[PDB]
Subunit: 461 residues, 4 copies
Amino acid sequence: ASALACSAHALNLIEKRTLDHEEMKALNREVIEYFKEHVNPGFLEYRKSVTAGGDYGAVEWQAGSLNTLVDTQGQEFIDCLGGFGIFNVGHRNPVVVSAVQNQLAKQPLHSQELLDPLRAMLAKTLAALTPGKLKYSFFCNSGTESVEAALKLAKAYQSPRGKFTFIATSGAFHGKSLGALSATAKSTFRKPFMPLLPGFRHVPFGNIEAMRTALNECKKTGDDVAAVILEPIQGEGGVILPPPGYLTAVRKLCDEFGALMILDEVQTGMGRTGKMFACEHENVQPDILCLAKALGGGVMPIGATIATEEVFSVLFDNPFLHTTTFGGNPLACAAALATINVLLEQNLPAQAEQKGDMLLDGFRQLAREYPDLVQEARGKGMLMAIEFVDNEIGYNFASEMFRQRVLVAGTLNNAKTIRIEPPLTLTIEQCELVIKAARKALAAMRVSVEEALEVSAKEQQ
Amino acid sequence: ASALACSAHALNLIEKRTLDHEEMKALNREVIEYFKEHVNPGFLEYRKSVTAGGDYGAVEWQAGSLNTLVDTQGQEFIDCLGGFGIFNVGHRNPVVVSAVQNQLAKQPLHSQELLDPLRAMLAKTLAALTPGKLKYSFFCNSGTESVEAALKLAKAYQSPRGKFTFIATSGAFHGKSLGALSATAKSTFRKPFMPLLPGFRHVPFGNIEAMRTALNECKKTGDDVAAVILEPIQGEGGVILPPPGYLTAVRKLCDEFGALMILDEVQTGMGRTGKMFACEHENVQPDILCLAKALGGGVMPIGATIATEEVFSVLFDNPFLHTTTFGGNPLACAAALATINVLLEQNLPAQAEQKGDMLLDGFRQLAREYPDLVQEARGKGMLMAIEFVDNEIGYNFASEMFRQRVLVAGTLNNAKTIRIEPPLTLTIEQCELVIKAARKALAAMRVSVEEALEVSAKEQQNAFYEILHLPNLNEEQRNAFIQSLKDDPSQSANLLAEAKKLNDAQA
Amino acid sequence: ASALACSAHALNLIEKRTLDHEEMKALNREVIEYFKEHVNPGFLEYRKSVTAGGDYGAVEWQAGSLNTLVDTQGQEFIDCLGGFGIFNVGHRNPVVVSAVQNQLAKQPLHSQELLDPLRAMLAKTLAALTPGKLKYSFFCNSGTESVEAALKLAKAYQSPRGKFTFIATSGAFHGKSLGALSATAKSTFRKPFMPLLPGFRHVPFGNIEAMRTALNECKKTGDDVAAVILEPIQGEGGVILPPPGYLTAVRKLCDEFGALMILDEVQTGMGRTGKMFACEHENVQPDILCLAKALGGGVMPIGATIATEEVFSVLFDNPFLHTTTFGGNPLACAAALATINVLLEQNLPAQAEQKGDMLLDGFRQLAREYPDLVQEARGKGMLMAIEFVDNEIGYNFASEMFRQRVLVAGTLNNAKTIRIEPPLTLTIEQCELVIKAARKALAAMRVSVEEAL
Amino acid sequence: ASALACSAHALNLIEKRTLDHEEMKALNREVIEYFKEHVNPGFLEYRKSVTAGGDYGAVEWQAGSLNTLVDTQGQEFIDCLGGFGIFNVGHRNPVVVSAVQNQLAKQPLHSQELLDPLRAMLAKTLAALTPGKLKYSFFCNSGTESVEAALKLAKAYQSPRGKFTFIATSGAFHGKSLGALSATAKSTFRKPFMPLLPGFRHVPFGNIEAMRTALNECKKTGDDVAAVILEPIQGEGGVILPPPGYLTAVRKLCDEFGALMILDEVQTGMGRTGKMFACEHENVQPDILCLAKALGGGVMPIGATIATEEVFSVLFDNPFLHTTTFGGNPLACAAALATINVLLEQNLPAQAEQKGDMLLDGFRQLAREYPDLVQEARGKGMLMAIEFVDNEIGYNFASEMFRQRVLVAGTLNNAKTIRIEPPLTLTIEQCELVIKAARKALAAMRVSVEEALEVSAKEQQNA
Ligand SMILES: Cc1ncc(COP(=O)(O)O)c(C=O)c1O
Ligand SMILES: Cc1ncc(COP(=O)(O)O)c(C=O)c1O
Ligand SMILES: Cc1ncc(COP(=O)(O)O)c(C=O)c1O
Ligand SMILES: Cc1ncc(COP(=O)(O)O)c(C=O)c1O
């Protein structure tokens, strides 16, 4: 068809709230054809590996309740994926939806010349919400943009001081824009795109001595380290918790060598680990803090890079040194201001702690019961993972859970590991249903394995 | 206060549609204090340079009509800034607002595990809307992200073919993320952040022979070019139009050397130049096309990177090779689908042509009338610029226009140049009001100058010769001070003082 | 065998001045086996492509006269290869051999702690010999080392000034050490070894406007140029002469943008183009000058990097910033001091001019006569090339010349192009014999072709 | 003057074997003026810091015996500097001088088109002399060129295998050419010349776990290691001996990750540590071995890069991929062939062991006696160092030794550390004279210190 015809057919679909069997069958059939012909036929192959065929062709339609998703066939899913840590305050949180709706009625995007007042308000808010000397905020549209901004603040601070080297950690995930991907550590994500930014070096996560070595060797050779960047807990790494005091030691180590400390709280921020930021567990103040995902309330894309006056002041003489067109737009600021208001009003950080403790205990118990399938369960607050024995078992679990209308998925920088990242608003009853679904899934998986194994050993001579 | 207290005070402000004198005075005072203490005190200094004091402290409040903005004091501005090419279909275009409102009621952000249907629909739409073999779309949240995606598609296609070098053009602006900024060409934007991506080289824009040379020399030395990236017309460069046929020649040149052609239509896309894409003027099909700004309808942030099946197929075996969390979200897709529907239904590309022709004629005439102030006016469709004689005159114009409630601003990779980028929906009457405002501004500027001052010729010529004779400067330094002096004759006293200092210092 | 046994057999061979048929046959057979098993079996394949089989297995033995080489079978060759521009003052120039012999009797290599007096003397000599404000000399062991030193002087001068980009030219050859190879321009020499030094960009040779563009674009993007490096005439490029005034323009262009001018006279230096340095043709003073090959007199390996006090003074606060163990050794300095003495005493620069004019005229005439085989002949002084129509014809010429006991070979950054780089001491009679050999070679090549059909 | 005039005056000086007081005074005065005006006035400042003035202006004239140097004033020095590890077989070793003299009479430099037979002979010799599967030799003119060749062999082998990262060690010294300097580890030698080759990372020397980490992390991030390069013992680092088995472990570690092992034996090679190569102590076979300094016999500049057929075969299809004009020249080959013959015939590796053990014991004993001045003495064979308490004490020792006509000097990647690198041919009596000179030097230094202190205290009491 013409573009006009397709743009029309699609606006008509946006208005529709419901689909009869025929409208559903037609839309499902279209979305699969169009993913294949215009988006990525690879996404259809992946979703098959993590489903029992026919289930891969599930099409999102609307939010059910705070903690559920409904497909085009009316099937309601409990959300333990949380859009990879976006939906901290649930799906269509009425307070966030309200703030966005209200700003949409006045001015959704700004001129970038007149002072936009929600930018000023969210910056003031984030300054009050953040620890210590974190004071200035730069707004962008994603995690990867927030990391680019951080790397850039560090570069501008440190190049006149003669420092250009950056240290990241293996298993680390900081985004996929080429500046961010220089810090991202997974080989398969980096190799095609090399050469990446020069002067990026990786040490093991949670190993302070390896990091000391790297900083010291860089100092010896005249390749002095501008910054260390790390996640307080590695998400895509498979929920990798550092040894206690590690973050505090990295801060002293950065202080000693005159390197800037960059904390990537894109995925651990906005209450998910049981505090507003995972750096609050140790009362660690980085030089630069990166936020996205949940900051937009599961309604708007937004990122934020917050830094000390000492570091951020690099942008004061020429405020156009770093810019973006959409960053700090009124819809996004409204969504973030709502999200902070919701998390604080309802003490959802405290809820994440209680519910995470409850869920992790549940999973650790299933791990004890199914060591043939599960290596270990880890977490902190509502950031959790189950590591299975091998990759194919992890995929069978994702499918079994999906069959039972519970939504989980794999981690990026870690195969065979399933993230459990539900909304902080997940109810105690849903928490219990999740554990029962997990149990039913593991029992079904054990049968599959035992069956196969008989149907194999038969082969001999 | 607590964060809770500030988040509350701010949600209260989001609900309010009106401000009495007291609410306005209190909010203005807050926004200025908070910009200074938590955003950037630099932005307050810049806005002063481009206003008569008290005017710098104008605070955005809401959209007036399709083509106007209203501050906290109720002053309505005609928008010739267009948010730097975002507001193609105007402020709160009811069709776009409607689509976003409708999708917000179902699902604003997606899971990233279930197939999201608006992604599929917008991708199908963009495939039909785009020229030739452009077929696959990757959605992100900004121009800079769309450029990163393009660079990444090229890298993945070309590294197994042994090609790693990228060519961009001087004056070029492709974004500020470190991959994008490797292609961005302005010194002041790059130097603090070097070293940038290796293998990035710059040729003059609109010079096919310089580009041939660069590709050929790279081939000779074994540093073969993976891709050429260029804007069809340089926006931040100051609306720099290439010679006609240039784009067509770059395409044949890329075809000959086996390099991928990347077109950055972030700022020339969605009808702004008089066609849906500026590559349609010459019927040029790039390998990879970058879109953002206007694609979101002035409601949502979105970027799109569209490419051939041949190039994009690099993402098919591992679909996680390039991803983003928010990219291709349902709100953004709804906003884009609406925007395309609006541009096509109302033939706004055709309107941009007519209104741009009208506005450019107006500006070229004011240029004829005020050669003491204006060097030249250029444009294509509703992408236009006025180059003034010097930077300070450009700033005086922006201020005079703002005094008269018409919103313009400067370009990034070009000082003393004012962009005129109004909504394609600007009415013929507003077009005329814009020209009258410009005229009034230039007349007032002439008076300011003529306020017992203007001539300074020999005053300048004296500085040229004194600077040239100072015996302790090297030839790069003398050359840097004389380029400053002829480029901006109104700083001859300042530049002379500076040169005398450094001459004394090398005795 | 043991190493002791092989080191013994070889010292025995070094003492021998003559080989009977049996000693020759045994040594030839050994050298081919050992090239194959321990050096490079590739060198044996190349030498075959540029010979009529049996001729590829020629083994160097000794210098004949100033301008000839003798193989193990006693066959004497007129040398028009000149070891690629080493043998400017001939083979075993008695004045150079004498100086080396004399220093070998006192101290061949230095301590690197006591002031070594020939270093001081050769540096003083090179300062007097070089144009203008070229004053300080750093001694190394090769062309590539002399270029590394130049690149390093530029880096140390310009990094505190915020400039890091370097411009070289396509067809350019500056050596094969990884710093030098970043400036070297031929793809097949660079691709395996990438990534090379960052911030190295190439413009066409002899195109001042292309170079202006590159400097200007680098300035616009904040990647300002530290230095331009170029050969005054590209040797490995195939004897590529720049347009007149080009070098002078590059100097003004460097002056304007505040970039350092590096001239690589490794192959055009020590009189080969008709002056002591090719930069003297236009009276061009670079910031940094690179020398090797002929500077050692065809006896010693040496390189020299000479620069202004302004640039070299980067090494004054810490004189260990750039060092080499063997560089500026007394044998090498003795050899260079002798070589300069010989070139000046006998006005061999002037001879190179006259003999090059004579030889080039001869070749241009053969080009007129054999356009089926020869595209063109070029040169300046005793730096000359014949470009053939295609690569295989160039190889047939090298072979035909070798069959007639005249030694020529191909260029590096240019196929199908044969360098003629004889000693400046080549006699007028030899010059004429060379032209007659070339004629006989082309006539035989024409027959081969006409045959084939 | 004209260049002709100076080239003449200098050839006149090359012929002279003797200088009366007037010829000496005139030549010394010239050499100092010319170092200042045309070489480096910095060399004159450095040599002052390591002498009592008047002594800084000592000018080399000729070799005395195998193990001594004579200045323009006829003062004979015992050589414990060894030209930083060049003079393994002494000054003007008659066997080396003979081979060079003999080849000079036939063909000193080659055409580079005809097969040069000494290249073939030295390559065959070095193949027999080297351990295991080391088979192919490429000849150059210096240590830094030999390292460039190694880096290049690795790059050509490993880039088609998708590996581009190189690991070196801190304190490491591999040369000053920009490829080599990318592996060299001292800050002050690198910073002015950055950016250097990309893909170069440094681990601590003698720390196998730090190196494992680096290889593993590079593998995880897709920046896989092409090669490890290290000295078996760091010379410029200040004679840093790795823990025993380190080299063996690095070899297994390289084998595990598929990285090439490059051993830089430029300074530990040709018998200096008590074996022909320091890699023979642990029977470690690297993929690529680098040689220079002593390989030329203290007569000729030469470097050699030797590698497996597996690695070197990258140069077989295009033999012009890596070349040099002077490399593998007949004089240099003659000098190297002589040097190998001398080292093997006279078992100088075994002598280096015995004499080094003797000298190191002597120094360790002086360390016990002078802990106020000396931190420690280390070595292996005739590769030795004395670390002093502070830099200025190190310089006072170098001066005191020079005053007593014994030649020592500092290390590059280590201040306050004096290298003792005498010819392997140093006689037992000279060994003893060296120890006595060291003793006399330390005793004089102690008196200087003790005197200062006495002067201070009395002035104070006097108040
Ligand atoms: C720790 C971390 N950093 C950065 C990102 C990238 O965020 P975005 O996809 O919005 O660019 C992610 C997303 O998964 C993340 O988990
Ligand atoms: C041509 C072009 N590309 C890229 C960008 C950057 O887009 P964003 O600001 O959305 O990152 C701009 C912004 O002005 C632009 O004009
Ligand atoms: C211009 C130029 N530079 C550098 C070199 C390299 O000299 P070497 O082979 O001694 O390193 C050459 C050799 O042909 C040359 O012609
Ligand atoms: C171990 C080592 N490698 C390399 C070099 C550099 O060798 P050259 O000075 O011959 O360039 C040296 C010199 O001191 C060295 O000791």
